[PDB]
Ligand binder design. Structure first.
Ligand SMILES: O=C(O)c1cccc(-c2nccs2)c1
Ligand SMILES: [Cl-]
Lengths: 242, 242
């Protein structure tokens, strides 16, 4: 139920890159990747952790709903879109770390740990700062593990309210047209080597769902756009999107 | 509160057509239209009725959720996409009338009439056949009334569970990208004169929401693409979308 398609490596080599794309066909219950080993290598989730962090904040009432405004703390930061008020949707859209670091502080060490165990999330280890462990702490998760987690989310099978899971899946909305819907989240781990970029989510089709999880060596922010572009090239090759 | 910009009539007359666009700025509580009379003229809702119909079906348990499969009855119809199994998402996307006719029959006359009054939906008159009144029956709704209904749906203020409204708003998803999300529903009314096409919904921005409701003369199916094409050009012109 796992095949290695090394031809996808071209899509990484065309861009002088290195990484893995993992695809999962829900209907066929069958997985596909260019590199099974990197597919099972666990990394810092970085801002892909904003998915579980959102679920937990919502289910605990830290976030009332997707319209609640989280006021800028007035601290100017070097990402302009962070220096403004946000709600859950825009916070996820722009990967606003400081808003989610506030979520985590209010969640707390004990509840965060208990919830990630309930989620069976990666290595379930939050060692480090309660408000940065997913950027430079001990938590690790692989691409195949990201998919497993996402499959539960898609099916409302995580041990949080159906409402919390619906709200996050709405916040995850990235792209939709007449051919498909993508709900996903980007990630960018920089504080601890190796620097990598993430893209995890799923593609909704009329008759199937293709879960995906990719990470790639990201020495500089210059190549961040390759997270989505390389994934789409593979999706296009496998005839999943036009 | 309202403003009429007759100039916008060019959007319709340049395609040898006539119609109305109605825009509502949620933040400013302001409305805009090319034609005040036609914005308050009531037409058959046709497939835009699948919004309230889905809400009622879900809230009464006629539809369990957006994953439940409604099996094709094996009767070949002239729309290829209708000759398939469907769920709430795809039945909305393809305006699968026979799936929603079965919804109505199970909903029943009494509960249907009573929910439409609860919704304050159009003239609230289901006279005709319970499985087709929104096609050739007595119910009517205007573009402004469509907006009054959608705004309640957005704010989860309709008299159904939040879950029912979230699910229906998920099923309304039409387009999403880095700039805006459109949730909407198309309509096409041919059984009573005048033949018209609908497009109703809203566009979600980072800092605002714009509700829209449009209908336009549709003497043949050739011009159905204009329902969304014209609307988006008004949105671009008003700089609501790039
Ligand atoms: O992709 C992401 O999740 C992400 C998260 C936070 C910051 C960034 C940055 N983008 C440019 C320079 S730092 C990206
Ligand atoms: Cl959605």
């Amino acid at each position: 139920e796992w095949q290695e398609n090394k031809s996808w490596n071209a899509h990484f080599t065309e861009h002088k890159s290195q990484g893995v794309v993992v695809l999962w066909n829900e209907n066929k219950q069958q997985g596909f990747t260019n590199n099974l080993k990197r597919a099972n290598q666990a990394f810092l989730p970085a801002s892909t952790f904003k998915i579980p962090n959102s679920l937990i904040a919502l289910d605990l009432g830290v976030v009332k709903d997707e319209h609640q405004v989280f006021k800028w703390d007035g601290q100017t930061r070097d990402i302009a879109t962070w220096n403004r008020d946000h709600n859950l949707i825009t916070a996820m859209k722009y990967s606003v770390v400081p808003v989610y670091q506030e979520f985590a502080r209010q969640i707390g060490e004990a509840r965060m740990s208990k919830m990630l165990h309930a989620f069976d999330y990666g290595n379930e280890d939050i060692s480090g700062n309660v408000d940065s462990f997913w950027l430079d702490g001990g938590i690790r998760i692989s691409a195949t593990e990201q998919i497993s987690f996402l499959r539960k989310l898609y099916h409302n099978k995580l041990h949080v309210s159906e409402r919390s899971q619906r709200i996050v899946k709405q916040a995850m909305l990235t792209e939709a047209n007449g051919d498909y819907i993508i709900r996903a989240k980007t990630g960018y781990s920089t504080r601890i080597e190796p620097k990598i970029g993430w893209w995890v989510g799923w593609v909704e089709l009329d008759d199937n769902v293709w879960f995906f999880a990719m990470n790639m060596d990201m020495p500089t922010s210059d190549g961040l756009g390759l997270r989505q572009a390389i994934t789409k090239e593979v999706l296009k090759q496998e005839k999943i999107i036009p």
